Design a protein around this nucleic acid. Structure first.
Length: 367
RNA sequence: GGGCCAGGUAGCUCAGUUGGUAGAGCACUGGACUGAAAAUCCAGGUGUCGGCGGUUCGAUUCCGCCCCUGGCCCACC
């Protein structure tokens, strides 16, 4: 119906940006971004009115948002910067070639891919490529983004783009860039499943040294990241119903040898979840002594005591140790399995003494 | 429209962690009190401590998804 309304209003609308990429990559998304030649606000208003839904206008930006079913739609007026702007001008201001394309929703040309800069070829050749040499200068954040994309789609930076990125970082543009944008970009990064590769690209181009104060790369942390990769794989394999956010674990491993002050500062600026802060604060100090205790563990009940109160993340960090791996595993798929019938339980009840008794019975069962 | 921090406790205004049987100040019923009423006295409702599942013998607490309010945040690729 969008093409019909665009027909009536004498306008031209196009699906634009990452969405198009995801369409050509086959990935389905419920977030659609439109670029309109002419007024996008009226298009959004009318479209929202016909489907009988609410609309959220933004006149100052010249954009509007509306939600139809599971679809989240954003209509944006074509602009030449971050006189009427042509679609080409709206596309030329973007980051990468694969992100610079468009698909016409206009009825006559409907189903046509609009690609000026050859983003189709770069999507075909698995190449992350900037539109112009000044790209990373304009928005330093794109640097991270580039790597991020190169992480997810398994693409490669062109030699041009690589030199330009390295030049951008070497000019220290990463520090001058807004902190919030960078932090949020990293937040987007750690939510990727291929985020480890993104960390390899962060290592290669050394962006984390610029963003994070005091951060350095050694081999131990890297191998720890790979061990964490295997652990995450197995855990998300068998125990997958218990899944939590894995990227934050990698983030903890990165900041592991870092100072606690800059660490708390970083988790502060990153707005990390509560359990992440708990896990980190527990890791910086109590982790060592806990490991020592798990090493001294003989009976299974002591293991239960030293494990059960802990979160899943802590246990995942305990799987780093080879000696504790089979022990933590045995704790997961075995050490907790139990129940009790009616009559017996009723006899266990014949305050806190009930709980103590129950624990005595469980420790009577284990060993 | 996406993150998080909080805040979510009575009718309003607010505290509460090693999981273990819940509180304040003013309105609410009932009776003693009155010609009626109020003050005040005795007491006692002050409540599925957001909604729904899960773990647990047991969840206001541990975790997961959602409901609401407020603020910080990005708000493009």
């Amino acid at each position: 119906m969008v093409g019909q309304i665009a027909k009536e209003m004498g306008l031209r609308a196009y699906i634009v940006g990452g969405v198009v990429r995801d369409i050509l990559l086959g990935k389905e998304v419920w977030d659609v971004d439109f670029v309109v030649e002419g007024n996008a606000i009226e298009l959004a208003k009318e479209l929202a009115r016909r489907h009988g839904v609410n609309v959220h206008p933004f006149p100052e930006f010249g954009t509007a948002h509306l939600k139809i079913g599971k679809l989240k739609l954003e209509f944006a007026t074509a602009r030449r910067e971050t006189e009427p702007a042509s679609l080409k001008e709206d596309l030329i201001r973007r980051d990468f070639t694969i992100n610079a394309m468009a698909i016409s929703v206009n009825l006559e040309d409907y189903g046509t891919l609009i690609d000026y800069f050859g983003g189709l070829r770069d999507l075909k050749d698995k190449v992350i490529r900037v539109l112009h040499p000044v790209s990373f200068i304009e928005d330093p954040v794109r640097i991270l983004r580039a790597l991020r994309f190169a992480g997810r789609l398994n693409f490669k930076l062109s030699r041009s783009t690589e030199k330009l990125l390295k030049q951008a970082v070497n000019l220290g543009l990463l520090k001058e860039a807004p902190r919030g944008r960078l932090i949020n970009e990293i937040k987007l990064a750690l939510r990727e499943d291929r985020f480890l590769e993104i960390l390899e690209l962060y290592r290669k181009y050394r962006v984390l040294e610029e963003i994070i104060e005091g951060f350095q790369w050694n081999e131990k942390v890297l191998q720890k990241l790979y061990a964490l990769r295997k652990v995450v794989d197995w855990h998300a394999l068998e125990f997958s119903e218990e899944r939590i956010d894995y990227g934050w674990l990698y983030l903890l491993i990165l900041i592991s040898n870092l100072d606690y002050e800059r660490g708390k500062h970083f988790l502060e600026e990153m707005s990390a979840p509560s359990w992440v802060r708990e896990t980190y604060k527990f890791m910086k100090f109590k982790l060592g002594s806990l490991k020592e205790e798990l090493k001294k563990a003989k009976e299974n009940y002591e293991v239960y005591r030293l494990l059960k109160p802990l979160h899943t993340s802590v246990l995942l960090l305990l799987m780093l140790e080879e000696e504790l791996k089979e022990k933590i595993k045995l704790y997961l798929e075995k050490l907790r399995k139990v129940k009790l019938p009616k009559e017996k339980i009723e006899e266990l009840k014949k305050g806190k003494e009930l709980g103590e008794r129950i624990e005595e019975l469980k420790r009577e069962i284990m060993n």
